[PDB]
Design an enzyme around this catalytic site. Structure first.
Site, PDB file in Angstrom:
ATOM      1  N   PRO A   1     -28.512 -34.386 -12.655  1.00  0.00           N
ATOM      2  CA  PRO A   1     -27.071 -34.370 -12.332  1.00  0.00           C
ATOM      3  C   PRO A   1     -26.441 -33.021 -12.702  1.00  0.00           C
ATOM      4  O   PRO A   1     -26.945 -32.313 -13.581  1.00  0.00           O
ATOM      5  CB  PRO A   1     -26.462 -35.495 -13.175  1.00  0.00           C
ATOM      6  CG  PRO A   1     -27.622 -36.424 -13.454  1.00  0.00           C
ATOM      7  CD  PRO A   1     -28.830 -35.529 -13.512  1.00  0.00           C
ATOM      8  N   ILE A  64     -27.988 -36.950  -7.085  1.00  0.00           N
ATOM      9  CA  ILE A  64     -28.711 -37.761  -6.064  1.00  0.00           C
ATOM     10  C   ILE A  64     -28.430 -39.239  -6.347  1.00  0.00           C
ATOM     11  O   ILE A  64     -28.448 -40.039  -5.404  1.00  0.00           O
ATOM     12  CB  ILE A  64     -30.209 -37.397  -6.119  1.00  0.00           C
ATOM     13  CG1 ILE A  64     -30.385 -35.979  -5.557  1.00  0.00           C
ATOM     14  CG2 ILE A  64     -31.035 -38.429  -5.375  1.00  0.00           C
TER      15      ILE A  64
END
Lengths: 110, 110, 110
Positions: A1, A64
């Site tokens: 992230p 994602i």
């Protein structure tokens, strides 16, 4: 992230090592290995949040993992508000979070 | 809406309170309540715009209101160019605006 | 194209004129005229990359040219890693690139 935190707190008013603690907190909150967590903190900016120039912070979270529903991100959001209110002594009304989905092809490594 | 302004003007060359005036201007231009307007100004950066390191500014505008046509954003763009040219004494060729659509689920509050 | 580079290297440790060399390099790598290349460098930030606060850089590349496959961006990525490793004396593990597609309607000019 990828976490990006903008704040109008001066650099010398932001707790030392905030980027390290937010990295470790994000790994735990998001359930991701800390070696895939990225944090950028940009202090000393000029900011208005909700029309006001009281101290504030804007957090962007790109991953994602991001699912396009509030219910999917609501627990994560609550944890990040708890984290930032305690670290920066901000009220809940002085933080906003934005979530952004990414796909693997967008990330250039090696 | 979320406005983010990057500039290579030094912090002490950017008019005092620009973030407050851009907040109020954005509320009027976008037709949004000022208590939903957010502005971040990042001065003193190293920037090239259109290949050149003359003074410049990049403005990003992210909102649930953003419609994916130029004609929908052209009036807003013109207003923001008028705002920044007068505040920062920049020529029209030294500003670029990017518009980004958001959906409600992306915004974490409370 | 729009390039944005965040780094925890202090402003006075970042090579003089990096924004100009990255502009010229990006024009060559991306096959775009330099008068359409935009570069923003934000140094002196607090950053963790892959869980670590060693020197690092994050590069974002936004363009109308961005095709949503890794194979389409892999040659570009390799060039930008070569560029940043040599300019900032970073290891390949201390850089990450994110690619973002844009459409023409998103860009406000004039």
């Amino acid at each position: 992230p990828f976490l990006e935190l903008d704040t109008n707190l001066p650099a010398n008013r932001v707790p030392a090592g905030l980027e390290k603690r937010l990295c470790a907190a994000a790994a735990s909150i998001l359930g991701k290995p800390a070696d895939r967590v990225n944090v950028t903190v940009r202090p000393g900016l000029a900011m208005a949040l909700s029309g006001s120039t009281e101290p504030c912070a804007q957090l962007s979270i790109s991953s994602i993992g991001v699912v396009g529903t509030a219910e999917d991100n609501r627990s994560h959001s609550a944890h990040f508000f708890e984290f930032l209110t305690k670290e920066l002594a901000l009220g809940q009304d002085r933080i906003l979070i934005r979530f952004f989905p990414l796909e693997s092809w967008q990330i250039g490594k090696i």
